[PDB]
Design a protein around this ligand. Structure first.
Ligand SMILES: [Ca+2]
Ligand SMILES: [Ca+2]
Ligand SMILES: [N+]
Length: 107
């Protein structure tokens, strides 16, 4: 479950990436329903994912990305984590900021 999203969508999205290395963030964003949320709602999601409230989603939080949807969900592999980072880190500082997060989700 995730605030603002349908439990059925979140559960199906988690099932869709059950296999190691099958996680594709853009497919996950669409399946879970975040890609269809308003920009304002996408920003809310960001602050939840930013676990230590540093203002940025760092690699360690990216690795445990799925835990925000279910505490028992698997960690992303180092390969999945790095691809996630490479796709969203538009300014090259090694982390994902709120605007980068929103850009990655809204096409
Ligand atoms: Ca953080
Ligand atoms: Ca960045
Ligand atoms: N972090």
């Amino acid at each position: 479950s995730f605030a603002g999203l349908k439990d059925a969508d979140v559960a199906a999205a988690l099932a869709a990436c059950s296999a190691a290395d099958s996680f594709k963030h853009k497919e996950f964003f669409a399946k879970v329903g975040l890609a269809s949320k308003s920009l304002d709602d996408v920003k809310k999601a960001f602050y939840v994912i930013d676990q230590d409230k540093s203002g940025f989603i760092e690699e360690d939080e990216l690795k445990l990305f799925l835990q925000n949807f279910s505490p028992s969900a698997r960690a992303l592999t180092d390969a999945e984590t790095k691809a996630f980072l490479a796709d969203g880190d538009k300014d090259g500082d090694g982390m994902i900021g709120v605007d980068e997060f929103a850009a990655m989700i809204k096409a």
